[PDB]
Every structure is written in structure tokens, then in C-alpha cells.
Write a protein that binds this ligand. Structure first.
Ligand SMILES: *C(=O)[C@@H](NC(=O)Cc1ccccc1)[C@@H]1N[C@@H](C(=O)O)C(C)(C)S1
Length: 640
């Protein structure tokens, strides 16, 4: 029985060597070649496993229900059940039998071809036929396509039908001029090592209409992934790339010929979009006639995915950022439907998924404004926009009297002399400041004093009723918002800065839209939703109804009052409640610090839409309010 345990260890080591993919190690655990022992030599067994398991992309061999008993003086029968993963899914309940040979002081496996698959005889062969699945679509709330499989017009040249050294340069310059292509790049393409004279060398995809084709140029129809909105949704949707051998080694169910999601929703929803590969894995006779079918299922095309996104709102929100750094979130605040998630600047996902030059890709990566960032999912200090949450907290716990008038003299203020050189700063020298005045002029000193008056304990008590620390049920990679680094401020200065949205606060635009939805639901926080069919989830009694009915009229005055910080939006003539902000950021990079512009706005009459826009590292005389007119007009018209 001390040898039965040795045979157990031998079978375990053999299964492990197969599982780890080291077929040489597994083959060396077999006895010598014979008719009573192993059916093949070690190198023959290695090539058999390598060829067959590699053809089926076998990964993760796991055994169970093992039993091994003595059969003769040196024979030891073993048996187990096996499960393994292939290109067509899981092979479950595989019954493996065999024999072991004990000799001298070592136990080896009398190898037989039934140790590759249970029903394999002498020189049986394995066949695998597969049908690739079509990738599902991503569509907006009205069925318009955001990511589909289209028929693209590929442009290319045949170097043989181009010229003979003289007319070649003429046709190269003609094809380079008539298609906005660098004339040096065309020759760089027809001079790669893989090119041959009679070959078709692709260059670029033609977006729509096909110009006149000079000599050598030809248009071939090629089907592939297509993104209609382009850069306007590139961060959200993402792109797909060719599947590599390493992708297959990680997940065998990928079609070693299809496309895999590399970023955004295409990657987050890769499983539901790529479908399931159909086909048949069968054992055949040595002549080629089928013996038994191990696996067989038919193709399952990927299912479509419908988003809450509005395509027209998405394109308008993106275009309004003029290619500058920033982002925009538009929701229906009563349900959380994310109408638009724009981030700028952006990259071309169509030229990214087809053929992207490595200098173009390095330009995207080295761009200081970083077009690959999903800015709607990046944490920022919310700026002066955060006042209206602090004020709502101050109204709930009774610290703030909406009509009590603080007397503020100057543009700088500090609690006492212990603050040193630091002082809270406002832009407008208004002497008599109450709550409505503070929201209209965006007065930091009023907010800082009221925050210090209510104290850290009451402040954090009101803040904890929001979504700080929560992970929203969204297929977008993001970090949870935070009030500060630790659970305590341990600083009056940091407490005041957090009071007007400027401390260690980190809230991304989507989390901002969720927190600010309280003013459109009488203090109920409505979680944002991106998938159209999901049910609305909310969180009641975050702030009081009295605080909403007090602040929202003041937010109307931020627009309508002649000195309100959002008064330019009065030109729209639509019911608006807004709040602006300008956060100062110390970014060690160049001359002094930069600043971000923020705008929050929603319809206070019907609560039909809500918008949060930002400009990151803004230019002088630039702001989010300056650019919000078009998106606000659209949302006001189409979302009552
Ligand atoms: C809120 O964020 C406030 N911003 C500051 O106090 C810092 C600052 C930075 C640059 C210029 C001026 C002030 C106020 N909110 C914005 C705004 O609503 O646009 C103001 C510029 C009114 S300050």
C-alpha cells in the first residue's frame, strides 16, 4: 500500500504536467515502449499531445474521483474523471482508465492513446471545425448604432500597376494628393518586407464617397467593426483589436481569428458581445471517418446592448468642448438615465481598430491633454459647485439661517491668526452676504465660515448620506468618491476648503451627477444608469425637502440675477437652475497652477434633464458655461 500511494503521486504529477502544458515532463513519466507498456516512445507521445491539445486549445485539465488499485504483481490499474477547457467550451465527465507499472524503485504510466481522449484507439485522429460568431451591436436609447459591424471601403495600391520609375512617382503623388495621404507613407507601405509586386497594399479606409482612382489605386470592400459617432464616443464605447495568441492562451473560447474589446464598453462587455463559437470537436478513424463526437454546439451570435445614451446629445456634448480638455455628463435625473458621457480630446476609434500607425498611436499616448482618459470617470475637486451641497447640509442641521446676513469685509478672510499666510478668497467684495447672495456671487468666505460654524462632525454626518465610498453599478472603471484622504480632516483649513469643494475631495462627473440629482427629486438621490433595461435605483432622504425648496430658487437666481455667475445662460430664455465653479489646481508642470471650470444645470420646472460640464486646464476667458448653450437647448427641447 506504500506503492499504491506512489502510483497515486505518479498519476497526480502526470495530470499536473499536462495541466501546466509541459508535455515533455508528462511524457517522461511513461514506461518504455512495448505492447505491455507504453504504446509510443517519449518523443512520439510529446508530439501527440502537443499536436492534438494545441489543435483543440486545451487548458486547465482537472481530475477528480481518482481510484487506483493493484491488478497484478507489477500492474496497477488507475481511473479518474476529468474536466478540461477547449475552443468550444468545457469537456465534463471524461472517464479515463489506464495502468501503471512499478519497477525497481519508480512507478511510471503505461501510456496509451486513450490518455489523450477516453475513446482513442491505435492511430485515431482528431478534427476540429469551428464557425466564428458575429459580434453584437451597441445601440443608443433610440436604436441608433454606436458600434456595429459595417462594410468599409478599403483603399489600396498594387505596386505593379503603378509605374516604371517615372510614371510611378506621378501616380504616387496623384493618389497621395487625391486622398490626403503623405506621399512618403505610400512608398513606406509598398516598401515593407512583406510586400511583393503583384500584391494589394492597403492604405486607409474611405469614410464615404470614393474619389477618382488614379493608376494603381483600387477599392476593395472589407467588413469590420465600425463606430458611427467616432471620437464623440471613443472613450465610452472603446475599440476592438485583432486577437493575439496570448489572448487565446488566457481564454480559449475566443475566436483565434476575431476581434477582442481593448477598451471601454467593447472590453467591459466583450463576453456578451463576442457571442459563442460554434463547431464540432470529434475523434475520427485513421482513414478519416468519424468515430465519436466529443463536443458539438452551433454558433450563438453576440447579443445587442442598448444604452441610455442619446446619440444626438452625445455628439452635441462632445462638439461643444471644441477639442479642449474637458468632459460632459447629461442625465435624466429622475431615473438616472445617462444621456451623454463625453470626454475631450478624443482619439479616432475607427482608425484605431482598422490600421493605426505607430507614430499616430505614439502621438495619442504622448499628447499632453491625454485623449485616452475617460474624464467622465476621473476624480476631480468639484469646485464651487459643491457649495449647494454644503448649504443643503447646513440647512438640514439648522446651522444655516437662509436669511441671516454675514458681514464680510474684503476678499480675504481667516478664522484667526493661527492660519498663518493662508486665507479663504472670494472674487466679489459684497459686504452683506446671506445664503442667496453667496450662491449668486459664489462666495467662498461665506461657505467657509458656515462650514467652520457647523463643525466637522455635523459636516461629515451630512456628507455620509451621499455616495462617498460607494461603487456604482456601472460598467465603467472608476474609483469611489472620497471626502478626504483619511476619516478625519484634522485641520480647520482643510474643513473650510472641503466646504466649498476644494479640499482633498475627489468626485468624478458621473458621481457628481448622482449627488446633485437630489435637487431634482426633493432630496432623493437617484443612482445613474447606463444600460437601458436596468431598473431605477435610488436612495431616499439624503437631504431634506426644505433644503431643496430653499436652494433651487437661489439656483434660479444664479442664472437670472444680473450679477449671477451663470447669467449668460439667461439668453436661452428657458427655465434654468445652475451653479458654476472654478477650482484651482497645483499641477507641477509649467508656469504656476492651472484651473478647471465647472457648470451644473438642470430644468427646475419639470426635472427632465440634468447636466454637469467641466473644462480641465482651461484657457484664459474660457469656461463650461460659455459652451453649454447648445446642449442645454437640445436637452430642454427633447427631455421634459
Ligand atoms: C468656487 O470655485 C470659487 N472659486 C475660487 O474661489 C477660486 C478662483 C479661481 C480662479 C478665479 C477666481 C476664483 C468661485 N466659483 C467661480 C465660478 O463660479 O465661476 C468664481 C470665479 C466665481 S469663484
Amino acid at each position: 500500500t506504500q506503492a499504491v500511494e506512489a502510483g497515486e503521486k505518479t498519476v497526480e504529477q502526470f495530470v499536473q504536467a499536462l495541466n501546466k502544458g509541459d508535455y515533455n515532463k508528462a511524457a517522461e513519466m511513461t514506461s518504455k515502449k512495448a505492447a505491455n507498456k507504453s504504446a509510443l516512445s517519449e518523443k512520439e507521445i510529446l508530439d501527440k499531445y502537443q499536436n492534438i491539445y494545441g489543435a483543440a486549445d486545451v487548458k486547465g485539465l482537472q481530475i477528480s474521483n481518482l481510484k487506483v488499485d493493484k491488478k497484478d504483481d507489477s500492474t496497477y490499474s488507475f481511473s479518474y474523471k476529468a474536466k478540461m477547457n477547449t475552443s468550444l467550451g468545457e469537456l465534463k465527465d471524461l472517464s479515463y482508465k489506464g495502468t501503471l507499472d512499478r519497477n525497481d524503485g519508480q512507478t511510471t504510466i503505461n501510456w496509451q492513446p486513450n490518455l489523450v481522449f477516453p475513446e482513442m484507439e491505435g492511430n485515431d485522429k482528431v478534427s476540429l471545425t469551428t464557425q466564428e460568431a458575429a459580434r453584437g451591436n451597441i445601440i443608443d436609447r433610440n436604436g441608433e448604432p454606436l458600434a456595429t459591424t459595417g462594410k468599409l471601403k478599403q483603399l489600396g495600391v498594387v505596386p505593379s500597376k503603378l509605374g516604371d520609375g517615372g510614371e510611378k512617382t506621378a501616380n504616387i503623388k496623384a493618389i497621395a494628393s487625391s486622398f490626403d495621404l503623405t506621399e512618403d507613407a505610400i512608398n513606406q507601405a509598398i516598401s515593407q518586407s512583406w510586400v511583393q509586386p503583384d500584391y494589394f497594399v492597403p492604405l486607409k479606409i474611405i469614410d464615404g464617397a470614393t474619389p477618382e482612382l488614379p493608376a494603381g489605386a483600387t477599392i476593395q470592400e472589407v467588413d469590420g467593426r465600425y463606430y458611427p459617432l467616432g471620437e464623440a464616443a471613443a472613450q465610452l464605447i472603446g475599440y476592438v483589436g485583432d486577437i493575439t495568441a496570448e489572448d487565446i492562451d488566457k481564454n480559449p473560447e475566443l475566436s483565434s481569428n476575431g476581434k477582442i474589446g481593448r477598451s471601454g464598453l467593447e472590453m467591459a462587455f466583450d463576453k456578451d458581445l463576442r457571442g459563442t463559437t460554434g463547431g464540432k470537436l470529434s475523434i475520427t478513424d485513421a482513414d478519416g471517418v468519424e468515430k465519436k463526437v466529443l463536443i458539438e454546439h452551433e454558433v450563438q451570435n453576440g447579443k445587442d446592448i442598448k444604452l441610455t445614451i442619446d446619440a444626438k446629445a452625445q455628439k452635441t456634448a462632445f462638439d461643444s468642448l471644441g477639442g479642449k480638455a474637458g468632459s460632459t455628463v447629461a442625465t435624466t435625473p429622475k431615473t438616472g438615465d445617462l444621456l451623454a458621457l463625453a470626454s475631450s480630446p478624443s482619439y479616432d476609434p475607427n482608425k484605431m481598430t482598422n490600421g493605426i500607425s505607430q507614430e499616430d498611436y505614439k502621438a495619442y499616448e504622448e499628447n499632453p491633454e491625454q485623449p485616452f482618459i475617460s474624464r467622465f470617470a476621473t476624480g476631480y475637486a468639484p469646485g464651487s459647485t459643491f457649495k449647494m451641497i454644503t448649504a443643503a447640509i447646513g440647512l438640514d442641521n439648522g446651522t444655516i439661517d437662509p436669511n441671516e446676513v454675514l458681514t464680510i469685509n474684503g476678499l480675504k478672510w481667516q478664522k484667526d491668526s493661527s492660519w498663518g499666510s493662508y486665507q479663504v478668497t472670494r472674487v466679489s467684495d459684497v459686504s452683506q452676504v446671506d445664503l442667496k447672495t453667496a450662491l449668486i456671487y459664489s462666495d467662498n468666505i461665506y461657505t467657509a465660515q458656515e462650514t467652520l460654524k457647523m463643525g466637522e462632525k455635523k459636516f461629515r454626518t451630512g456628507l455620509d448620506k451621499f455616495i462617498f465610498g460607494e461603487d456604482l453599478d456601472l460598467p465603467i472603471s472608476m474609483n469611489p468618491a472620497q471626502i478626504s484622504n483619511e476619516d478625519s480632516f484634522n485641520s480647520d483649513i482643510l474643513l473650510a476648503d472641503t466646504g466649498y469643494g476644494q479640499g482633498e475631495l475627489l468626485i468624478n462627473p458621473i458621481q457628481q451627477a448622482a449627488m446633485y440629482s437630489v435637487f431634482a427629486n426633493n432630496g432623493t438621490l437617484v443612482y445613474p444608469k447606463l444600460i437601458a433595461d436596468k431598473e431605477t435605483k435610488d436612495k431616499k432622504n439624503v437631504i431634506g425637502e426644505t433644503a431643496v425648496q430653499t436652494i433651487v430658487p437661489d439656483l434660479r437666481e444664479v442664472v437670472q440675477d444680473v450679477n449671477g455667475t451663470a447669467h449668460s445662460l439667461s439668453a436661452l430664455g428657458i427655465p434654468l437652475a445652475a451653479k458654476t465653479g472654478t477650482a484651482e489646481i497645483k499641477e507641477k508642470q509649467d508656469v504656476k497652477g492651472k484651473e478647471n471650470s465647472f457648470l451644473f444645470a438642470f430644468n427646475p420646472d419639470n426635472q427632465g434633464y440634468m447636466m454637469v460640464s467641466m473644462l480641465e486646464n482651461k484657457e484664459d476667458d474660457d469656461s463650461a458655461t460659455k459652451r453649454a448653450s447648445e446642449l442645454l437647448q437640445y436637452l430642454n427641447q427633447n427631455y421634459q
